[PDB]
From a paper:
One family, the ferric uptake regulator (Fur) family of metalloregulators, is involved in the regulation of iron, manganese, zinc and nickel homeostasis through the activity of Fur, Mur (manganese uptake regulator), Zur (zinc uptake regulator) and Nur (nickel uptake regulator) proteins, respectively. Previous structural studies of members of the Fur family of proteins revealed that these transcription factors fold into two distinct domains, including a DNA binding domain (DBD) and a dimerization domain (DD) localized on the N- and C-terminus of the protein, respectively. The third metal binding pocket is the regulatory site (S2) and is composed of residues located in a region referred to as the hinge, which links the DBD and DD. Gene regulation by CjFur occurs in both the presence and absence of regulatory metals.
To further understand the role of the S3 site in CjFur DNA binding activity, we carried out crystallization trials to solve the structure of the wild-type transcription factor devoid of metal in its S3 site. The structure shows that the protein assembles into a biological dimer in which each monomer folds into two domains, the DBD and the DD, reminiscent of other ferric uptake regulators. The modeled zinc atom is tetra-coordinated by C105, C108, C145 and C148 in the S1 metal binding site. Despite adopting a V-shape structure, no metals could be modeled in the S2 sites. Intriguingly, akin to the S2 site, no metals could be detected in the S3 site. Instead, four water molecules establish several hydrogen bonds with residues forming the S3 sites. The DBD of CjFurZn protomer A undergoes a clockwise rotation of ~5°, shifting the C-terminus of its α1-helix inwardly by ~5 Å. The DBD of CjFurZn protomer B does not undergo a rotation, but instead, its α3- and α4-helices are displaced toward the inner portion of the V-shaped cleft. Altogether, these observations show that the DBD can undergo asymmetric reorganization when the S3 site is not metalated. Altogether, these results show that while the loss of metal binding in the S3 site can be compensated by water molecules, it causes a distortion in the DBD that negatively affects DNA binding by CjFur.
Author numbering:
A (entry chain A): 8 to 64, 66 to 91, 94 to 154
B (entry chain B): 4 to 89, 95 to 159
Write the structure that this text describes.
C-alpha cells in the first residue's frame, strides 16, 4: 500500500526542481520529508535547527528558506504569521471523483455522510484525520 | 472531461505490470503498455485474437504483434493479474480493504465501513454509473505520533 498523497507531493517537488534547473539533493529530500512526516509546524529557524540536530550532513538556513519559498509558491505548503512564519502541508479542500473506465468521463462529487464516517473511522483508531482520497470506478450510462 | 485526475487503481495495476515485466527480463514498451490499457478500459472478455484485433483497430501506429499479445497474456496469467476460461481473459478485480495511513510513522490501518459502501452505491446510481470498484485512503497522524517530530 503506497501513500498516494506523499508520492504525489514528492513527484511534484522533483518536477518543480527539474523545471528550476535544481537537483533533488539529500538536503532538499530531508527538508520535504521532515515537513511531511513531522507533526510539529516549523519556522525556517526551527526547521533549520531541527535538521541540524537530526542530520548534521549542510543544511544551511538559506537552503531552508529558498526551499520553503519554492514550496509555498507552488501551494504545496501554507504559512501563517503571528508575531517567524510557521508552515504546514497544504490540505486544500477538494472534491472526490467517479471515473468511467471505458471513456474516461469524470464526475466530481462530495458526500456529507461519507465525510462524517471518515472522521469516525479516524477517531475509532486514535487518528487525527488530515486528508483523504476517494475514487469510484465504473461504467457510465453512455458506455453501458 | 476538462479535468486531470490520475486513475489510482490503474496506476497501481501498471506498477504491478512493470514489476512483472522487470522480473521476466522484459522491457516496458508502448506495445505492452497498450495491451494492459485495453484490458482495463473495456468490459469485453478478450481472447488473444480479439485483443490483437481491437488494438490493431484502436492503435494501428503501434503495430502490436500476435506473439506479443500471447506472451503478455501468459505473463499476466502466470502472475494472476488475469484469469482465463477454456481462452477468454478477465483482469483480476479482487476485493480489498480501505486504508488509513499515519503521515509520520507510516503505520497503516485496514478497514471497511458499510455506511460508506452504501453511499458509494447511491452515488453511482444517481449518475447512471455501474460501480465496479473504488479506492479510499485516509491520511492522518496516529495517537503515537500526535504533536511529535518525524520518527
Ligand atoms: Zn463512459
Ligand atoms: Zn504514527
Amino acid at each position: 500500500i503506497e501513500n498516494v498523497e506523499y508520492d504525489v507531493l514528492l513527484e511534484r517537488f522533483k518536477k518543480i526542481l527539474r523545471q528550476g534547473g535544481l537537483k533533488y539533493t539529500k538536503q532538499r529530500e530531508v527538508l520535504l520529508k521532515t515537513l511531511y512526516h513531522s507533526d510539529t509546524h516549523y519556522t525556517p529557524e526551527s526547521l533549520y535547527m531541527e535538521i541540524k540536530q537530526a542530520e548534521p550532513d549542510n543544511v544551511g538556513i538559506a537552503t531552508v528558506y529558498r526551499t520553503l519559498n519554492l514550496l509555498e509558491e507552488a501551494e504545496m505548503v501554507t504559512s501563517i504569521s503571528f508575531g517567524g512564519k510557521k508552515y504546514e502541508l497544504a490540505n486544500k479542500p477538494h472534491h472526490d471523483h467517479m471515473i468511467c473506465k471505458n471513456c474516461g468521463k469524470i464526475i466530481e462529487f462530495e458526500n456529507p455522510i461519507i465525510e462524517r464516517q471518515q472522521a469516525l473511522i479516524a477517531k475509532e483508531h486514535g487518528f487525527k484525520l488530515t486528508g483523504h482520497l476517494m475514487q469510484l470506478y465504473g461504467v457510465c450510462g453512455d458506455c453501458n
